[PDB]
């Protein structure tokens, strides 16, 4: 059984994850 989204939103919050945050850093260079 795979994890859903709204429980995985609870995952990155409760486990103290920054992997969602760290990927948003390397995604952008000159978005303007």
């Amino acid at each position: 059984p795979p994890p859903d989204e709204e429980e995985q939103l609870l995952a990155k919050f409760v486990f103290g994850d920054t992997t969602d945050l760290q990927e948003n850093l390397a995604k952008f260079n000159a978005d303007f």
């Binding site: 103290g16 948003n24 390397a26 260079n29």
Partner: protein
């Protein structure tokens, strides 16, 4: 070297690493808004409330700050310390904050940017790690009280050693000491690489872009003696003004005119460089208010140089481009201005190019000469071309009326050029 030299080199690399409590109470205590006692007693959680509440106001002023709340000003970005992360991840934290201080630098008089950057000061340690792009973004506010606070935190880099006497000083850093910064040949090479980075994002604002040139004029001014110093200076300044003309913005283009005209009067540039500069001024010249400033460059640029080929005909790609952006009627309304600038050495190169390339409109070539009192050698150098044109062109009555203007004034000048080339009776026989 010695021991204490190498062992103070470790101190710079761990300038942010909080090790003892007293080390933390010195690093965390410094900030932009709160004084040294009330700053040390508050969480990052407290600071993030005031920042994210303020940053949503800046997103209302312009929507560009909305992206940083996803990455830097997000709630998950409290746990991340710089020191824990790898070397590739830190450069992305720099390239976010370097992208941040561009957008931040414009709205810097406003109160919400002071509460916004402070969390990016105190959590992300930009007053130690990257204080070049912190200071280069905010280098134009030297009179303001907000830059006096910015000095009261930063350990100054080795390139900003001129301001090092103004750190935690009473009075603001004065206007000449800002010039002693820009007088260095290395500090300019930042402020190029800051500006060409700042143009690519197309966020260059009016008060900033004045203070660039108002320093870049003075650097040419303080070095107007040392001809060696100027010779090594224009790979720095003219490569800006080349890239500063490539801007879509009309406001950036007028700044390139201020640096070009000032440097051209201070150093006689070559003919090929001035014709190079005159194309790039012509090529990206779109708006109204950029055109008026652009015409007073070529008015002034052609008078700076003087030598053989001073009054040469313009090249083909140059001239029709100049006819494309500047009209032959609009150049006449320009000469009728009661400012009446010295348009003297350019138009005698403009008129000769008409005589060779276009030739359809020589009604104008009379009316050009009534409006400007020319120089002595220029009129001779014009009339030689028209007499060459008199033989070659399929003979025309309006060309006869041009010489009637020179039968009116300087009759012997018409004779002496005919006595140099050709016959006296043969020209009047030709018409």
């Amino acid at each position: 070297s010695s021991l204490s030299d190498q062992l103070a080199q470790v101190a710079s690399n761990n300038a942010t690493v909080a090790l003892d409590r007293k080390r933390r109470q010195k690093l965390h205590s410094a900030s932009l808004i709160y004084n040294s006692k009330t700053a040390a007693t508050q969480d990052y959680d407290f600071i993030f409330e005031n920042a994210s509440k303020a940053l949503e106001e800046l997103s209302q002023i312009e929507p560009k700050f909305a992206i940083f709340s996803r990455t830097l000003f997000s709630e998950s970005s409290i746990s991340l310390d710089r020191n824990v992360q790898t070397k590739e991840e830190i450069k992305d934290l720099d390239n976010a904050i370097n992208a941040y201080l561009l957008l931040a630098s414009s709205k810097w008089y406003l109160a919400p940017t002071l509460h916004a950057t402070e969390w990016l000061v105190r959590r992300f340690q930009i007053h130690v790690k990257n204080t070049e792009m912190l200071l280069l973004s905010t280098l134009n506010y030297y009179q303001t009280p907000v830059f006096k606070r910015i000095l009261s935190i930063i350990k100054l880099p080795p390139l900003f050693n001129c301001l090092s006497n103004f750190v935690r000083s009473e009075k603001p850093p004065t206007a000449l000491t800002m010039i002693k910064l820009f007088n260095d040949m290395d500090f300019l090479k930042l402020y190029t690489s800051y500006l060409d980075q700042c143009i690519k994002h197309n966020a260059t604002y009016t008060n900033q872009l004045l203070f660039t040139t108002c320093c870049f004029i003075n650097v040419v001014a303080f070095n107007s003696n040392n001809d060696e110093k100027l010779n090594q200076l224009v790979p720095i300044l003219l490569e800006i003004s080349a890239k500063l003309l490539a801007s879509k913005s009309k406001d950036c283009q007028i700044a390139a005119h201020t640096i070009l005209v000032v440097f051209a009067t201070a150093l006689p540039l070559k003919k090929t460089i001035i014709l190079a500069a005159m194309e790039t001024i012509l090529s990206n010249l779109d708006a109204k208010e950029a055109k008026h400033s652009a015409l007073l460059t070529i008015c002034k640029l052609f008078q700076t140089l003087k030598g053989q080929g001073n009054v040469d005909q313009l090249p083909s790609k140059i001239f029709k481009l100049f006819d494309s952006k500047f009209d032959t009627v609009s150049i006449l309304t320009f000469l009728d201005k009661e400012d009446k600038p010295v348009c003297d050495k350019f138009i005698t190169s403009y008129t000769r190019s008409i005589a060779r390339y276009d030739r359809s409109k020589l009604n104008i070539i009379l009316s050009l000469l009534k409006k400007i009192r020319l120089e002595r050698y220029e009129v001779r150098l014009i009339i030689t071309d028209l007499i060459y044109l008199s033989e070659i062109l399929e003979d025309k009555s309006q060309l006869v009326e041009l010489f009637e203007y020179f039968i009116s004034i300087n009759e012997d000048l018409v004779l002496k050029c005919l006595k140099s080339l050709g016959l006296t009776g043969x020209x009047x026989x030709x018409x």
